[PDB]
Amino acid sequence: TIKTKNVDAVFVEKQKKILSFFQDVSQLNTDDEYYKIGKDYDIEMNMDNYTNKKAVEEFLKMYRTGFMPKNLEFSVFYDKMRDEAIALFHLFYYAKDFETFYKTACFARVHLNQGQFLYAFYIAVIQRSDCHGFVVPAPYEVYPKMFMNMEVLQKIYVTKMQDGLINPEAAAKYGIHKENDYFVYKANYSNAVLYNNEEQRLTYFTEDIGMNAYYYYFHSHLPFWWTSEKYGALKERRGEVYFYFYQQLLARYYFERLTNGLGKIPEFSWYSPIKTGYYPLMLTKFTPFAQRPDYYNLHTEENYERVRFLDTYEKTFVQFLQKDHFEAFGQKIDFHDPKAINFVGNYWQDNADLYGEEVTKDYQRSYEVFARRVLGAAPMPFDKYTFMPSAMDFYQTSLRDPAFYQLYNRIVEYIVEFKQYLKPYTQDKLYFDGVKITDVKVDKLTTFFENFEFDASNSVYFSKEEIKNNHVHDVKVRQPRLNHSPFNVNIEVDSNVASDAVVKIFLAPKYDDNGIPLTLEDNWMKFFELDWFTTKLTAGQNKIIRNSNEFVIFKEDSVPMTEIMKMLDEGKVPFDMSEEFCYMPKRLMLPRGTEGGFPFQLFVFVYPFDNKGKDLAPFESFVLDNKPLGFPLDRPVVDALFKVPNMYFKDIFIYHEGERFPYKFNIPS
Amino acid sequence: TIKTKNVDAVFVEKQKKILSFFQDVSQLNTDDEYYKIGKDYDIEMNMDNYTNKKAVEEFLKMYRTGFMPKNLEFSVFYDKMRDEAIALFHLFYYAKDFETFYKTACFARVHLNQGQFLYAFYIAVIQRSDCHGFVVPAPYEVYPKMFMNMEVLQKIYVTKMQDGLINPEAAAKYGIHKENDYFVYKANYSNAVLYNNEEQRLTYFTEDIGMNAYYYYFHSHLPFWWTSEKYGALKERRGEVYFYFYQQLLARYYFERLTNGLGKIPEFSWYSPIKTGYYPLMLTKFTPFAQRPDYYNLHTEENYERVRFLDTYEKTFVQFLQKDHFEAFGQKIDFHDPKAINFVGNYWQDNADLYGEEVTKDYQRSYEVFARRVLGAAPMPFDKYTFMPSAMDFYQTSLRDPAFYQLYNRIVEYIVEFKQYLKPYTQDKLYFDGVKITDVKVDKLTTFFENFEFDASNSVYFSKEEIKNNHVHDVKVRQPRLNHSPFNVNIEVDSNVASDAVVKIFLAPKYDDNGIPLTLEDNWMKFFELDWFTTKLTAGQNKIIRNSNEFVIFKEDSVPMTEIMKMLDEGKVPFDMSEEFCYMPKRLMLPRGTEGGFPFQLFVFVYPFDNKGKDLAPFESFVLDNKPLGFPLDRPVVDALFKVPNMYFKDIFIYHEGERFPYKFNIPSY
Ligand SMILES: *[C@@H]1O[C@H](CO)[C@@H](O[C@@H]2O[C@H](CO)[C@@H](O[C@@H]3O[C@H](CO[C@H]4O[C@H](CO[C@H]5O[C@H](CO)[C@@H](O)[C@H](O)[C@@H]5O)[C@@H](O)[C@H](O)[C@@H]4O)[C@@H](O)[C@H](O[C@H]4O[C@H](CO)[C@@H](O)[C@H](O)[C@@H]4O[C@H]4O[C@H](CO)[C@@H](O)[C@H](O)[C@@H]4O)[C@@H]3O)[C@H](O)[C@H]2NC(C)=O)[C@H](O)[C@H]1NC(C)=O
Ligand SMILES: *[C@@H]1O[C@H](CO)[C@@H](O[C@@H]2O[C@H](CO)[C@@H](O[C@@H]3O[C@H](CO[C@H]4O[C@H](CO[C@H]5O[C@H](CO)[C@@H](O)[C@H](O)[C@@H]5O)[C@@H](O)[C@H](O)[C@@H]4O)[C@@H](O)[C@H](O[C@H]4O[C@H](CO)[C@@H](O)[C@H](O)[C@@H]4O)[C@@H]3O)[C@H](O)[C@H]2NC(C)=O)[C@H](O)[C@H]1NC(C)=O
């Protein structure tokens, strides 16, 4: 009941070497051969084993100067740390073949900082062509400390320090149980100990382990600091991809807001206090994460120069808008051209493609970075390697901070400003000659919470003894997560001539906060894409059934590594972990319903699938179409020029079943 | 089924006379009896027909000076207008008998400002002993401009200016119909044209006409400026009525917040911006009301001296709290004494009883007055009779403004700080020997919206012909209003020995915003009294059935004045308008539910009714007990010390049926 895939001899060996690097991540097994290789591995001597002579040499210059020390906390948002990560990445990426790649990782495991290494290695496995189709573990199994509050962490430490339970019945009262040879820890979301404002209503979504894993994967698939030359025709669509990822996410987030009675993400000002604080319960081996109190003055002394930069970055965009056509960064740009999204997105991201370069440079200040830093409310870094981490210093923690959504909402709104320059689609562009959707029905939509466990053993240090006996996997975290029942969408379509067609499904809200029905005019960016697929219509009447379990845009829960070691002994590999790893998890498709049925709408659009003109398959198997991302809702709409027979809006209601509140799953006795 | 009451021809005559002063309020019928008496009436010559000679002369002195001109807006919140209102009230109240009273109203309607007159007259009818049992129209029938936005108002005006509909079918699409000889106007709540913040979710409550008229009723029953000498032993409990009135109302408001997903009423500072604004869509005669933008700085140039006053008022109270026992206002007060609540409430309302005087004075500056003026964001009055009205200048519009609830929550919070000094009740105080509640059961609790019409004719000006011909009642306003289904509360009590008993029923929330069950300790002031009554227990097993419809804390909807004239020809008067006018309306009892059923809980309490030592019937039969208002939840609680077998906590859910959004009742069909 987990989507499998079969696998040969050479594959399993490599995959085992790859997975070796994600276990006991913060320690070293002296007896493991990865260590014997690693200790003595000579990079200079091996120079002929890399595609890029200057990458080896650049790495070597940095490595003698000195890399970040071990145990210190790694973040890519800081110059020196990132530069070392990139130098390391290149070395992984330009290794002639697997053997060389493997050995280089061995050395790097042994000699360099843990976070820096996993960061670079993870990315490398995703980017190397010979590695395509291999599997990596879930971010939460690799970095467990970042996916869980203190309370849990500390129970784990205590149990480990005691080598078990002094009182099993007392431990039980704290949600700690022995299940055969596992220690299982129940975990509440933070609102169960902290309700310091209404945003805490959303913790089952913002603290969700999958959602946060999802953002991490997105970063890794194409990090901002690197070109996208490797992905070919997506290079000319990179900005579009950046807008759409964020647009989709904020729609999804917004949906969660609506169902907990919260409305719009609030606007903010670099020159004013920001309302909602963030009080993180994460610990770092060396420090606590930094808090932002409520009404925090973003314009305090330490931030003056920072705010001057950020304000100018924005103002420079506002200038672009005002002048329509202009030259910036070596490019004549026209805001009338829909292709300009590429520039717009690239600018807001300060990625390598903005400059037409392979890697970004220190003097090219990113807006995202400094915005993250200021809103993170940290004191000034002590030095190049010693900073006070906030949620927004890591891709694995960002979604936890309401301020993150404020920051990307603002960015998305500026891109929407650019999108106002595009002419709206006319009838002719949308009309599907002789095709009409006559009905849509939907099975009941119910959400519900359900326990989920993940391997949390990397959070813990084992003894020399335990590392040798390989007893390194006995810590699991149990947590209630959002889920929903599978559902069919029944679509009835009429057409004169048989034809190849594209079907698209979107989710959007039905009402604003006041209970007025949504116009497309104001609300086209609040539509969330559920699925696209192709069918063949016949003359007459058509019945199209599509199940939620088969929506192209979502993945299944990933499998724990231990379960993957099991499968590799059988020649099996978890399919969704191989090629669908960076999709949103299925269980989070729907926002949490209400007991009464919260009102939403399904938008179904059917259009002709002409041929395979402009065709994305290098980055994402997403857009085998000539069409903008989120077509037909990638620009302003006029309600009356828009609605055509091959469109259907269906009113639907999202229900919720069982326990309403995650914490009711975590009570003892 | 409108609960009736029979009456004699002498009553009928007097009642007609009282009603006449509420028709065509802003105009004068030269042809009517009231005008003939009025024009010519000589007060000085009739000195001997007043109980109090000094009041007649106090009034004559002011009236020679000049009173507020006609047509300006009247508010009791300004010194000079208040003083005129009161000198007038005194004239009404000290009239020897009804004849003199009547003739005096005639004079006052002819010569004085309409608002000032209606104000004084309304209170007079309530306060005068020989008028006890008589009936007054609902405040929305008398001040209809105060219970409606300007959209409806302008349609009413346009129709009147045209003397009909130029296009019935086009009028239909604006929600205007002739029905009989009436023009009927559908009206939405303001959120239908205005969603300037989350607080607009609560419009069907805060704008509700009964809810608003109810506040007006509370004030008229016992205004701050006047003594409560006339209400017997109420005098010793005035501050208690003050607190409880607001505590209850704020609990009820809070429920509406909860069921609309909004949580707690926010705290503010006279030195900081206040976040949520108020954009009123009401009109008066020669101005709109004042707007308060979001983030309005309470501490601007114009408010400096006001805030210094307001700030000192509060801190003086804080000083009381720190001192425990003090001498103030010529009274020795001890905050450990539960009776101190009288002083505490009197202090916050700054009422006549704080000083032991008949009537408050200009030099006794009121807190509520100055807070209202500050948060209303109006500019300085032009002069003693010309101000810019805000919702908070009137009892009939205050509930409309978010700031209103913030202000009274602040006061109520301060009174709650005083209640911290009170010893929590022990087991022995609450335990009813040999008595146990074994089950509580409740029919389905379900709200719905439902069309209600009222007479808005006082909003219009009529011609010479129409006034002469009594064609002066043709404007109706129809509006969806909250209601709920009737329901039964089934209570099974066990007692060894037969005994007379009191049963109380409260409503409370189940959870906070995080969905933790609310504990009694923090939330004993979040409880809303639904009913109290007595039964006779017998040895063994008891079953008490109480319909919501028999809950004594609430009244039925007022009848229009039009149906009262018809009734008075049958010798009948509407009972709930006579004896129960100042109770909360029944149909707003429950907060608007949810389709899935929002969680609350009932608290049911049963205790001994061995005699009737101290009981109130001068104000009205509310507290037939020497028990505090809101007993056993009138002081703070310790969960373990509290739970007793004659209490029962039952979980309930409040549903909503049919349309959830009122505007869906107001769409024209095509
Ligand atoms: C545009 O703006 C301007 C500026 O604001 C507006 O101007 C205002 O207009 C008002 C009229 O609407 C006016 O008020 C009236 O003034 C009358 C005259 O006031 C003087 O005299 C009186 C008393 O008279 C005696 O005085 C001397 C001194 O002893 C003697 O020697 C004389 O012989 C007299 O015996 C003084 O008291 C004043 O100080 C002035 O000097 C007022 O008398 C009149 O008062 C009446 O109205 C009051 C309320 O309506 C009422 O309380 C009072 O008892 C009076 O009642 C009489 O009048 C009513 C109708 O008003 C009538 O039906 C009764 O039968 C009764 O006889 C007014 O108060 C303002 O003075 C003026 N403001 C200024 C600054 O000049 C202007 O209206 C506006 N225009 C438009 C189109 O909007
Ligand atoms: C309490 O607080 C203090 C203050 O912050 C902490 O003190 C710091 O501790 C760290 C140790 O954790 C020290 O770093 C070490 O410094 C050593 C020497 O530093 C200098 O010399 C390096 C070596 O070169 C020398 O060569 C010749 C000798 O023949 C001389 O001519 C010359 O002067 C040089 O000194 C230089 O390269 C360097 O620039 C320094 O100026 C280092 O030997 C040592 O390096 C090792 O460790 C690295 C770990 O990342 C690794 O990269 C290297 O490969 C190498 O093996 C090490 O870094 C800081 O010097 C010290 N700071 C200060 C200001 O004194 C203290 O740790 C803390 N205590 C606790 C308990 O928390």
Ligand SMILES: *[C@@H]1O[C@H](CO)[C@@H](O[C@@H]2O[C@H](CO)[C@@H](O[C@@H]3O[C@H](CO[C@@H]4O[C@H](CO)[C@@H](O)[C@H](O)[C@@H]4O)[C@@H](O)[C@H](O[C@H]4O[C@H](CO)[C@@H](O)[C@H](O)[C@@H]4O)[C@@H]3O)[C@H](O)[C@H]2NC(C)=O)[C@H](O)[C@H]1NC(C)=O
């Ligand atoms: C109280 O508040 C409610 C909530 O706003 C008000 O409800 C609105 O009333 C208005 C105007 O009276 C309603 O507008 C009419 O909708 C008609 C039909 O439904 C539409 O179908 C169309 C046409 O294709 C769709 O495109 C729309 O989206 C609608 O669903 C429509 O027939 C009608 O058209 C008329 O006006 C246009 C002007 O451009 C002309 O072209 C045409 O000839 C015709 O005269 C109206 O637009 C509106 O729907 C109601 N609001 C909601 C949310 O439903 C109440 O009116 C208020 N009640 C009072 C007394 O004020």
